[PDB]
Design a protein around this ligand. Sequence first.
Ligand code: 6HN
Ligand code: 6HN
Ligand code: 6HN
Ligand code: MN
Ligand code: MN
Ligand code: MN
Ligand code: MN
Ligand code: MN
Ligand code: MN
Lengths: 313, 313, 313
Amino acid sequence: RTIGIIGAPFSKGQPRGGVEEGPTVLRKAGLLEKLKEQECDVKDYGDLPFADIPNDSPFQIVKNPRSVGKASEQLAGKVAEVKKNGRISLVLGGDHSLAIGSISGHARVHPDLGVIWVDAHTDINTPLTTTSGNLHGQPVSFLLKELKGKIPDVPGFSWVTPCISAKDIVYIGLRDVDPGEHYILKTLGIKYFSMTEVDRLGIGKVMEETLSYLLGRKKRPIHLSFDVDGLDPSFTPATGTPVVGGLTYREGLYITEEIYKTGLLSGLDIMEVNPSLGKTPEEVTRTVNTAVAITLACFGLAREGNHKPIDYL
Amino acid sequence: RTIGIIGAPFSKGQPRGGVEEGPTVLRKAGLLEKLKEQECDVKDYGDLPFADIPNDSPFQIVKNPRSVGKASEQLAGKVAEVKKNGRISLVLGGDHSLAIGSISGHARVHPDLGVIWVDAHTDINTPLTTTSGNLHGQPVSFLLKELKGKIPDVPGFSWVTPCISAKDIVYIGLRDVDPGEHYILKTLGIKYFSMTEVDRLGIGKVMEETLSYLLGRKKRPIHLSFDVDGLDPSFTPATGTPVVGGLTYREGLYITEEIYKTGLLSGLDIMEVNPSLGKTPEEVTRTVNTAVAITLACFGLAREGNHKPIDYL
Amino acid sequence: RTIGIIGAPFSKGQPRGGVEEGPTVLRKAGLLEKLKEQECDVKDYGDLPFADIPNDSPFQIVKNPRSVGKASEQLAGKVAEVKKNGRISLVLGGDHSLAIGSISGHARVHPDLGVIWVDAHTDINTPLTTTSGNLHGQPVSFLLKELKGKIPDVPGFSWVTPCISAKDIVYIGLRDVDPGEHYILKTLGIKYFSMTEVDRLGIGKVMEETLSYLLGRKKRPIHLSFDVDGLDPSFTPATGTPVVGGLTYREGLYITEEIYKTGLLSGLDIMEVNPSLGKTPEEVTRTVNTAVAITLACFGLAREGNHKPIDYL
Ligand SMILES: N[C@@H](CCCC[N+](=O)[O-])C(=O)O
Ligand SMILES: N[C@@H](CCCC[N+](=O)[O-])C(=O)O
Ligand SMILES: N[C@@H](CCCC[N+](=O)[O-])C(=O)O
Ligand SMILES: [Mn+2]
Ligand SMILES: [Mn+2]
Ligand SMILES: [Mn+2]
Ligand SMILES: [Mn+2]
Ligand SMILES: [Mn+2]
Ligand SMILES: [Mn+2]
């Protein structure tokens, strides 16, 4: 397909620093070249320069609010620009707090978008329910219209305007959800397939139900926010918040191959890859290699094989 | 839920000695504290003191019959006492021979109980079909009423009285069954889901069929005897009789989450954890960590998340 | 069952040399003894002596054509001889190019045979579509009647005569298919279950559909060509062309147990085991151990257990 690459070297949504190198190690893995090797029209919009915000004391428990809020604001603008150029935005990011800007900018051009959130976490804590204070665990709360009223005026996010409803999002891969987050899940009736649902139904039925749920009424642009920790740490160990018993490499590729086949992928986020957290150089390459594989599947690379519209014999 | 913890530091049902440290490493992993962290009312009935039986020569091929028989007799009494206190018995054990006492004592208070046996083995050898002579591979034969007549008078087990019928037990995870055991399986018509059935149907259908099979006619108390070697050794390596191709971490949690949701868990055994068999300190923690996780799922810990009956917003 | 073992220490269908030791390490693993331990009548037809062909320059891009062609010709004759003796041929091989001779000889005695190809690759490149020039990636093209006309006269294969039609073969495990191969797949309407189909349907449904597809109309002899790289490299690392995200140990045993139960297994190939490629001695034993396990399942070894037709009690 036609892609718009945008690097988001940002880490202030969480504690560990190596995540801001995500764009770097992914590009170094040959991601752009691999994409072009497929039927892909690629345009690199570069790495966003996230100016340093020295004065950024916590808002209550919430850490680096101004830095996070600004980074998302800048990203929102870049994503909308790539979308206005008629390209699928591909955000190579640092931490998941960037989802606020990615989905926000995406929704500016396509308000009817539907979101698929692949993650071990729901990232739906509010600045008031969070216990860690890390903003990468709160992006969804800022985007949901139903939660508008339970979100205090956190410095750096006055530009935010909830752009999705509880029913325009589906979670896949959940296995470490905070109490307050679970309360929000059940209270708002959010659609989710935790690892339990995946075990019960199988990834095939999960995807069928996911896509039917979001595209049932009518077709709409899809936004895939992919947290690499959604996959089991045996595949993506170099990440800040790993949780055992995750989605397999295969399921990861299944999810993305199915999303690709819809022809509706509109926005994509490959988040939380932290090269500095690899216990070994191999754990780093294993994580980056899996992240690239998942990305390539989102744009057409199929396990059964691919061939050009010609007569090979 | 409401739990009654009882440690069973016993190993004479098999050759390797480290298994008697199971209660110790599990408690040290913070199992009691983790349980209390959930909606659990926990009461530790302590570790059973299994007096030394110096004179215990083999009965034919059967090893340490008096020691094994006595340990189960003592455990049977403790389990019945915890059951009479209105608590779910949680036996942190050594080897699986202890199942004879656990199920026996449990059945004294709840004769209508149904058993789910998660294991790589059927543990249904009789003292006459066993080839190893290890009693942890024969517990089920002593408990089945239909096999009463094929069980010689083994020193130490005169107190035993078969308490379950062939149709009150379901096996999950089988992958190393002895010939005589398979003969008993097919002859008595015992319900089982070997790894082959799990591969064929998926763990979801397996659990649906398991619970429908045991609770179809009417609801009854459930006894879960969980041998950690039922799970693949990539998850629980520190165990005496590991067999490759086992149940995954995920399936292990699925089985237990589903049992929990029935609200009928009445007795639980977490067996065969042998810290001394870990090739590395990490293999030990990996095994103990998985054992704790499985235990927590049996008492409510759900992957989709948990929340108190309050308004979190 | 009744087996006819034939060693095929051959490697010239690909670059890496250790694969010709496959027969050796498998026999050393006790394969013959293990088979006899089951209800198996085993006869070792020995290791085929593949005479050295010093003058064998490439045919265009195609490497070692005369050596490969001769090795398959010799193997075809041996397989037909074992089949005429009323035995299931078990080819312990080197590289997969040997499939040309195995299926060829098998089809001489049983022209109505159906093939199940477990592999990460389709091995259907023609001498003209191949980009590697390695013949182990082209065996199927030489056997398919529909491709007769697109196969140049390659030195060493004048003895070949396509013996199977597009609809007498089913692929399972595909995850690295070349463009030209995919073109052939879709153009000839070949039945396949890539890793994507396995993820979608589950290995149970895959096997049901595979066997129904090949045995629907009427029962016929089955030929299983098993490339060990079909299974994930976490199980069979010592192989020349490994690809991540493969079939699990369990699925491997499921496939073969189901094939065994048909009672129609007529020919079997255990290919691509290369002891020299093991990064460690354990990776070598892990690969050989998995290969033996898969082989034993093909001849009756069931995970639920096995028992002789006698009264064990
Ligand atoms: N629920 C935890 C973990 C969040 C991880 C963030 N992520 O999934 O990108 C928190 O609120 O800090
Ligand atoms: N079937 C073997 C292995 C038993 C292992 C015991 N277990 O599963 O707890 C025997 O009878 O010795
Ligand atoms: N498709 C590649 C890989 C073939 C591997 C051969 N195999 O699967 O036995 C080629 O044509 O060289
Ligand atoms: Mn996460
Ligand atoms: Mn996340
Ligand atoms: Mn066991
Ligand atoms: Mn056991
Ligand atoms: Mn292959
Ligand atoms: Mn092959």
